[PDB]
Amino acid sequence: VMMKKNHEMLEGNERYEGYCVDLAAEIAKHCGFKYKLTIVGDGKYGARDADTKIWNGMVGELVYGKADIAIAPLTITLVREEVIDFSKPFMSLGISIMIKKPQKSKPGVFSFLDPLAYEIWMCIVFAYIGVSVVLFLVSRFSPNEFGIFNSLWFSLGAFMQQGCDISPRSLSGRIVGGVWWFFTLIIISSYTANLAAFLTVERMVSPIESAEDLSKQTEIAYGTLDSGSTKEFFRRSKIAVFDKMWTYMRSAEPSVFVRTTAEGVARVRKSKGKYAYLLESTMNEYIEQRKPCDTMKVGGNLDSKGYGIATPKGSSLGTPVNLAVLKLSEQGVLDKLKNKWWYDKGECGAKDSGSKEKTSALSLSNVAGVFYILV
Amino acid sequence: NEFGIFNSLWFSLGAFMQQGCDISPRSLSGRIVGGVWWFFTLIIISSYTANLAAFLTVERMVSPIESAEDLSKQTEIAYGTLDSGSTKEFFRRSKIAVFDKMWTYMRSAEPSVFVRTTAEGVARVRKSKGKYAYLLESTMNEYIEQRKPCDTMKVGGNLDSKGYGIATPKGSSLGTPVNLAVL
Amino acid sequence: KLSEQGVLDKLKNKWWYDKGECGAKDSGSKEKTSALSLSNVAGVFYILVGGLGLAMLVALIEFCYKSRAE
Ligand SMILES: N[C@@H](CCC(=O)O)C(=O)O
Ligand SMILES: N[C@@H](CCC(=O)O)C(=O)O
C-alpha cells in the first residue's frame, strides 16, 4: 500500500497505490464484486494479550465484522488460524535482518603516521635538531668536512637508512654517529610493527551475520515490530539462541519494540550500527532498493512463513478467493505483479553489485598525504 | 655535472630499492627532492611489509558463489538435482525469469542433467572442485555439513518453502486420525 | 525436599546467570591497539641524550691530549 502524488485531489479507491491495491482489482475482476478500501484504525497488524485476547490491530477489525475480506502482508500462523480463515500462500518469505550497512569509513589525509603518536614525531624532530648540532660542535674544533649543511645531511641520510655520503673519522664524531644509528633502528622497526598491528586487528574484525553472534553481542541492540508475528515468533520458541533473544528482548531497556516499520528503520540510521532490526524477507528487500542505500541483509532466512488472504470464520467469499489464488498462480499473475514492483526499484543503483571488491590491500587514500608531502 | 637524465633514474631507483647510491646531490635545491623521496619509500616499503603479514596471519576464504543470483551469472558451474521428484518438476515449472535461465541451462547440461542417488551427488561435488554444483533439500545439505568429511558448504538460502507430509490415500481409513496425531 | 530435585540447585543456575556477564565477551573484540606512547620508547632518548653528553666529554678529553703534543 503506497501513497499518491494526488493525495488530496483524488478520490475513491484510486487514492492509494501498491501491490495489494492492484491485486484487489485482480480479485475483483475474477470474482466479480465491488470493493471499498479502508485503513486500519490502529496502525498495527495484530496483538493478542494475556487478557480478553481482543486483537488490537487488523485481525480484530476482521474478527469483529468491521471488515469483510482483509488484504494485507499478514503472517499465516496457527494462532491466527484458529480464529480466522486463510487462503493459499501467494508469496514466500522469512525473518531477515536489517542493519546499518558498513560503509567506507573516512580515512585520514595523514593516516599513515597513526600507529605512532604526535608526541613521538615531535620528539623525533627535536632529536633530529640537536644531534646535528652536537656533531657540528664535535666536528668544528679546529685546534674535517662536516659543516652545518653536511651534519644535517648526514643525519638525514642516517635516519632514512638510505646510506651516507661520508663517515666521521674522529672518535667523538663516531660516537654520535653510533647512537643515532641505534636510535633510528628501533624507531623504524617500531613503526613497521605497529603499522602491522592496525592491519591485523582490522582483518580480525568479524562482521556479525549468523545472528547467533548477534545473540552473543551486547553492543549491537536489536528489536522487532510490535503487535505482529515476529514479536510472537520469539515469544513461543524452542531454540536456545531464540530463547536468549527473547530473554534479552523481554529484559531489554529501553523499548526495543517499535510501533511502526518506518521508525524502526529510523532508529537504525541514527544508530550507525548500534541498533539492529528484524523483519520479513520481502519488506527488508524493498528498503534495500530505495535510495539511502544504507541497509543490507545479513545471514540467511529464519523460517518459511506465508502471506494469505484473510476472511473471517463463515465468510462465503473466502472460497471464490481460493479459486482465484490458484488461477492467478497458474497463469503467474501473482508473479506478473510479484516481479513488477521489485525490478521497478532499480533506483538504488545496485551499489552492492559494484562495491564487493573490498580487500585489505590499501586504497590510495590510506597513503594519500605521503604524495602531498612529496609534491 | 654528474646528474644526467640517464644518471638521475639510477639515483632515484636505489633510493626506492633501499640501496645506497654513490652519487649524492650537492645543492640545497637538489638535496630536498632526494630527501623527501627517501621519506616516500620509507613508508611504502614498510607498508608493503605490514600488509603482507596480514594476509599471512589472517586468511580469508574466496567464495562469490551464493544467493542464487551469482549462480545465474556464472555459467562455469553445472547444477545438480534429483530426477523423479519435486526438483525435476519444480524447475520444469520455472516461471520466474531467473529460474528460466536455470531450467534452460539445466536442460542444456551434460551429462548430469540430474543424478539418481543422493549419496552420489555428495561424491560428485567432492570430486568436482569448482566445476559442478548440487541443489538439494536444505536439511539434507545441513546434515551432511554436520557429518564430518567437512568438505561441504551451504550457500545462499532457501529457494522455496516446502514441507514433508505423511502421504495417505485419498479417503484414508486413518488419514484424519494421523492428521490429528500430527497436531 | 529442596535438595532432592535441586530447587536449591536450579535457582542457583538462574540468579547467577541473571545479572549480566563480564567474561570472554570483552577480551576478544573490545580492544583496538593504540598509537605508541612516548613512554614505550622513552628510554631510547635517555640512551640518545645520554650518548650526546658523553660525546662532549670525549671532545673535552681530546683537547687535553691534543695540548700534550709538546
Ligand atoms: N507481516 C507481519 C508483520 C508483523 C511482524 O513481522 O511481526 C505480520 O502481519 O504478522
Ligand atoms: N522429497 C523429494 C525428493 C526429490 C526432489 O527433491 O526432487 C520428492 O520426492 O519429490
Rounded CA separation B135/B162 (Å): 14
Max alpha carbon distance in chain A (Å)? 120
A98 DSSP β-pair partners: A277, A297
3-state secondary structure chain B: CCCCHHHHHHHHHHHHCCCCCCCCCCCHHHHHHHHHHHHHHHHHHHHHHHHHHHHHHCCCCCCCCCCCCHHHHCCCCECCCECCCHHHHHCCCCCCHHHHHHHHHHHCCCCCCCECCHHHHHHHHHHHCCCECCCCCHHHHHHHHHCCCCCCCCCCCCCCCCCCCCCCCCCCCCHHHHHHHHC
3-class state of residue C8 by DSSP: helix
Q: State the chains in contact with B (3 or more Cβ–Cβ pairs under 8 Å).
A: A
B161 close to A304: Cβ distance less than 8 angstroms: yes
B147-177: burial string, b at 16+ Cβ within 10 Å, e else: eeeeebeeeebbbeeeeeeeeeeeeeeeeee
B88 within ligand 2 shell (Cβ under 6 A):
yes
Interchain touch B–A (≥3 Cβ pairs closer than 8 Å): yes
A108 close to A114: Cβ distance less than 8 angstroms: yes
Rounded CA separation A230/A74 (Å): 11
For residue B179, CA distances in Å to A81, A343, B183 come to 16, 41, 6
Give first-to-last CA distance, chain B, whole Å. Answer: 98
Contact flag A367-B157 (C-beta cutoff 8 Å): no
The total of other beta-carbon atoms located within 10 Å of residue A56's CB is 18
- Strand bridging mode A221-224 / A275-280: parallel
Q: Which residues of chain A make contact with B24, given a CB cutoff of 8 A?
A: 153, 157, 165
Rounded CA separation A88/A309 (Å): 8
- Strand bridging mode A275-280 / A95-100: antiparallel
**At what angle are helices A171-204 and A148-159 packed, to 10 degrees?**
40
Whether the CB of A187 is below 8 Å from some CB of chain C: the reply is yes
Contact flag A370-B40 (C-beta cutoff 8 Å): yes
Q: Whose CA is nearest to atom 3 of ligand 2?
A: B85
From the list C36, C47, C52, which residue is nearest A130 (CB)? C52
A330 close to A88: Cβ distance less than 8 angstroms: no
B83 close to B98: Cβ distance less than 8 angstroms: no
Half-sphere exposure of A192 (CA within 13 A, CB side): 18
Q: Which of A20, A200, A241 is nearest to A115 (CA)?
A: A200
Query: B39, exposed or middle or buried, with CB in 10 Å at 0-12, 13-18, 19+?
Result: middle
Residues of C within an 8 Å Cβ radius of A: 25, 29, 32-33, 35-38, 40-41, 44-45, 47-49, 51-52, 54-56, 58-59, 62-63, 66
A365 close to A107: Cβ distance less than 8 angstroms: yes
For residue A203, CA distances in Å to B51, B53, B181, C59 come to 10, 11, 52, 52
Q: Which residues of chain C make contact with A187, given a CB cutoff of 8 A?
A: 41, 44
Residue of chain A nearest C53, judged by CA positions = A134
H or E element at residue C57:
helix C42-66
Rounded CA separation A204/A199 (Å): 9
Write the Ramachandran bin of A314: left for phi over 0, alpha for psi from -120 to 50, otherwise beta: left
CA geometry: angle at B115 spanning B112 and B117, to 5°? 155
- The enclosing domain of A26 has a CATH number of 3.40.190.10
Owning domain of residue A85: 1-100
Q: Which of C18, C29, C61 to mutate to test the interface with A (most CBs of A within 10 A)?
A: C29
- Could you tell me how far CA A111 lies from the centroid of its own chain? 25
Contact flag B157-A195 (C-beta cutoff 8 Å): no
Length of chain B: 183
Rounded CA separation A59/A310 (Å): 9
Question: Under 8 Å CB-to-CB from A238, ≥6 apart: which residues?
Answer: none
For residue A66, CA distances in Å to A57, A60, A363, B16, B73 come to 12, 8, 61, 81, 49
DSSP 8-state assignment for residue C67:
G
Rounded CA separation A7/A22 (Å): 17
Hey, what long-range contacts does A314-320 have (CB within 8 A, 24 or more apart)?
A315/A68, A315/A69, A315/A85, A317/A31, A317/A33, A317/A68, A317/A69, A318/A69, A318/A85, A318/A87, A320/A31
Rounded CA separation A110/A370 (Å): 8
C-alpha cell, A275: 541498533
For residue B135, CA distances in Å to A49, A239, B90, B114, B149 come to 43, 27, 12, 10, 19
Q: Please give the method by which this entry was determined.
A: cryo-EM
Place of cell 614525531: A121
Residue B163 alpha carbon to ligand 2 centre in Å = 11
Residue A42 alpha carbon to ligand 1 centre in Å = 14
A119 close to A236: Cβ distance less than 8 angstroms: no
3-state secondary structure chain A: CECCCCCCCCCHHHHCECHHHHHHHHHHHHHCCCCCCCCCCCCCCECCCCCCCCCCEHHHHHHCCCCCCECCCCECCHHHHCCEEECCCCCECCEEEEEECCCCCCCCCCHHHCCCCHHHHHHHHHHHHHHHHHHHHHHCCCCCCCCHHHHHHHHHHHHCCCCCCCCCCCHHHHHHHHHHHHHHHHHHHHHHHHHHHHHHHHHHCCCCCCCHHHHHCCCCEEEEECCCCHHHHCCCCCCHHHHHHHHHHHCCCCCCCECCHHHHHHHHHHHCCCEEEEEEHHHHHHHHHCCCCCEEEECCCCCCCEECCEEECCCCCHHHHHHHHHHHHHCCHHHHHHHHHHHHCCCCCCCCCCCCCCCCCCCHHHCHHHHHHHC
Residues with CB under 6 A from ligand 1: A 45, 73-75, 225, 228-231, 280
A334 DSSP β-pair partners: none
C-alpha cell, A228: 505482529
Calculate Rg over the CA atoms of chain B.
Answer: 31
